[PDB]
UniProtKB/TrEMBL annotation, chain B:
Protein name, per record: Uncharacterized protein
Top-level taxon in the UniProt lineage: Bacteria
Species of provenance: Desulfofustis sp. PB-SRB1
Residues that hold Ca(2+) 2 according to the record: 28, 69-70
From-to range in the entire protein, with total length: 38 to 161 of 642
Binding of Ca(2+) 1, residues: 28-29, 69-70, 75
Length: 299, 103, 161
């Protein structure tokens, strides 16, 4: 495989034009979503950014704006002479400047129903529209990291029916790919970097890079974690493994039909970081969920 | 070298006698003080399209010959400055929120 | 204004469920959520440096962040708390405009010295959850109450109380 990283040497030029690439996004405006923002890359100096939203099913014409990392304005939106669609263009003047595109119906606050808009955003491309070779280029927006999560339950330790909670022991696995965690195996001389007996929050604090820290949503008291480990590979693949005994509060226990009642034990693991940073993508069936036990069982 | 400490409660304006970064706060820094101009540019900015970038160069340009808008540590470069003939910090309308553009 | 004005903080409390009631030691364990929101511009910052619109503090109480920032903050306490409160999702968000918000999901056992079980099982009780600001009135005051979500909440199935 090829490798990526930041280095130093003890300039020139590339062709005559920087790489230009554009992508599209279908943005849905609903009652619960009347505003949206999307972040972008570094945009090395001299690069130009073009944005254009159009309405598909109607003509609401949502306003557009372009700001920096902190929200300071950089570019406004002017409607074109032909009907529908908007055009926005901005050329940067400083290196390593992040841009956030804003779409908002601030004046159009009237509510009728969900609407869909097609937004075309490109870098270094002066193209009026999508034209061709749209997916050949790289994505211009900052994409949330993808993490695969797997949960298995070894046994149900107990159920407390008066305080409405249940204690369960199991195993949790997380796996993502953040190349910023990567390293050159030449220095350490090994193919894996290991963190032990520390949660994801602690290793994030002692590395100072974002990591998909989680939490059991209905946890009561201190979770008992063991075999807690984090493995990192030079290719950026990171995995977290934990064996947990946790008492989860269950506010949906309905013992009205006891002893014929059937209950739902819900184990919720919430990512502590926002959706724009990490998202649970898929579920890993590394081992059977319920598991096999010898002897009978209360539940 | 000459260094003067600067702090304003609201950034309304303080002149300097002629005979840069920020220590703290959210301030974004940049002979008569325009008082009502704050109000007119405040009301004009709201409910405006394809103008919020423009009002700066449109109206705030008449403090010219001293346009050295910092806007953050991105510049990080001193200016020697020039005097043609022998002879207001902050208050730069910007935005901070990300979920709603409120100047 | 010429006088130094006490800072205004809006507080909201919601109760997810009543975990339990201990009628002999006269206490009750309740789980819920607490939200605080004030505006202290001294907490402000320029988003140019950090490159973000929010500053986040996690897994730390208001006292701890006040200690590591060395500026006054509206630290609070559950007045009748017994033992260690179990806090999760504890977060503090600060905006450049000085707006600061604190969020916590708490399981707390509160001592209730006003349990009158003389009419049991026909007695009606008052579960009082008191949150006291740890700072004097001249610094911070609870101004208004935020109804960010329903106070009692909805539960599936019956309930002892």
């Amino acid at each position: 495989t090829y490798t990526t990283g930041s280095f130093q040497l003890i300039l020139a030029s590339l062709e005559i034009k920087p790489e230009a690439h554009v992508q599209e996004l279908e943005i849905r405006l609903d009652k619960d979503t009347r505003y949206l923002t999307q972040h972008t890359r570094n945009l090395q100096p001299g690069d130009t950014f073009h944005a254009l939203v159009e309405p598909i099913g109607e003509a609401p014409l949502p306003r557009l704006r372009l700001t920096d990392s902190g929200g300071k304005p950089l570019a406004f939106g002017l409607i074109d002479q032909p009907g529908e669609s908007v055009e926005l263009n901005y050329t940067c003047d400083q290196d390593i400047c992040e841009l956030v595109v804003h779409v908002d119906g601030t004046d159009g606050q009237k509510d009728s129903g969900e609407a869909v808009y097609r937004l075309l955003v490109g870098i270094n491309a002066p193209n009026l529209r999508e034209s061709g070779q749209t997916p050949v280029g790289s994505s211009v927006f900052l994409e949330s990291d993808l993490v695969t999560v797997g949960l298995a339950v070894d046994q149900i330790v107990g159920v407390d029916q008066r305080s409405e909670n249940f204690s369960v022991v199991g195993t949790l696995k997380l796996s993502w790919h953040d190349p910023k965690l990567g390293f050159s195996p030449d220095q350490c001389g090994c193919t894996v970097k290991s963190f032990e007996d520390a949660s994801i929050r602690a290793v994030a604090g002692e590395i100072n890079l974002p990591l998909p820290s989680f939490s059991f949503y209905n946890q009561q008291g201190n979770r008992w974690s063991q075999n807690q480990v984090i493995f990192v590979t030079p290719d950026g693949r990171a995995s977290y493994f934990e064996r947990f005994t946790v008492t989860l509060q269950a506010p949906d226990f309905d013992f009205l039909a006891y002893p014929f009642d059937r209950q739902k034990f819900s184990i919720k693991v919430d990512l502590a970081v926002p959706t724009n940073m990490f998202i649970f993508n898929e579920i890993e069936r590394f081992q059977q969920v319920v598991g096999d036990q010898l002897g009978e069982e209360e539940w | 070298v000459q260094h003067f400490t600067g702090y304003i409660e609201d950034g309304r304006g303080i002149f300097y006698s002629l005979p840069m970064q920020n220590t703290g706060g959210n301030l974004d820094p940049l002979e008569i003080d325009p008082a009502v101009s704050l109000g007119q540019v405040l009301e004009k900015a709201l409910a405006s399209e394809n103008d919020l970038i423009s009002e700066l160069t449109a109206v705030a340009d008449r403090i010219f010959l001293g346009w050295d808008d910092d806007g953050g540590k991105g510049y990080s470069a001193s200016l020697e400055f020039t005097i043609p003939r022998d002879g207001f910090a902050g208050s730069t309308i910007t935005n901070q929120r990300l979920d709603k553009f409120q100047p």
